[PDB]
Design a protein around this ligand. Structure first.
Ligand code: 43B
Length: 164
């Protein structure tokens, strides 16, 4: 009794972040389990529509705010110990009062911003860790907000591309 797409907070973040790194050409060792996993074929026209919307959603945002999160990035600093604690401290501010499709878009960007921050130095593997925490906060907050507010289909339906 919950759609038939199987959207996974982990997968969505893994794809979005995976694309961000692709732009640079970094073969992010995401699917460490590279043993040919079919299960039910890669075909996912269902979650495919939102994959583009969500993927493009962040891009359009980053282009609008090119002097907000970029600066705060310097505050994050560079370290594996504080990195994990800094993430939660940042997201916490993303939604002080309440959550909304409008604010969540910034959520994805954050991960990508902090993710690349590690790659810039020499902590590519860390990119995987970030995604782990991202899904936690997204599933522990957003998920509940989206699930109660229609769901994923809402975002894509509300913010749908031209025609299709
Ligand atoms: O305007 C906003 N939302 S909206 O009006 O409801 C909207 C407007 C357009 C679209 N879509 C249009 C097509 S693409 C697009 C998507 C989103 C926004 C703009 C365009 C969408 N949406 O798709 O959900 C939502 C909006 C504006 C500003 C912020 C915002 C501002 C300062 C900060 S600081 C921070 C720390 C986390 C943090 C750290 C690092 C980086 C980011 C955030 N996060 C912030 C987030 C957050 C949301």
């Amino acid at each position: 009794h919950a759609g038939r797409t199987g959207y996974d907070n982990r997968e969505i973040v893994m794809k979005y972040i995976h694309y961000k790194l692709s732009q640079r050409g970094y073969e992010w060792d995401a699917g460490d389990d590279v043993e040919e996993n079919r299960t039910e074929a890669p075909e996912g026209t269902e979650s495919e529509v939102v994959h583009l919307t969500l993927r493009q959603a962040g891009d359009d945002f980053s282009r609008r705010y090119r002097r907000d999160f970029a600066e705060m990035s310097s505050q994050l600093h560079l370290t594996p110990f504080t990195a994990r604690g800094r993430f939660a401290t940042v997201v916490e501010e993303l939604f002080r009062d309440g959550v909304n499709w409008g604010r969540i878009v910034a959520f994805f960007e954050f991960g990508g911003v902090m993710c690349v921050e590690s790659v810039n130095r020499e902590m590519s593997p860390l990119v995987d860790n970030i995604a782990l925490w991202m899904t936690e906060y997204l599933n522990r907050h957003l998920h509940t907000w989206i699930q109660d507010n229609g769901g994923w289909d809402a975002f894509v339906e509300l913010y749908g591309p031209s025609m299709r």
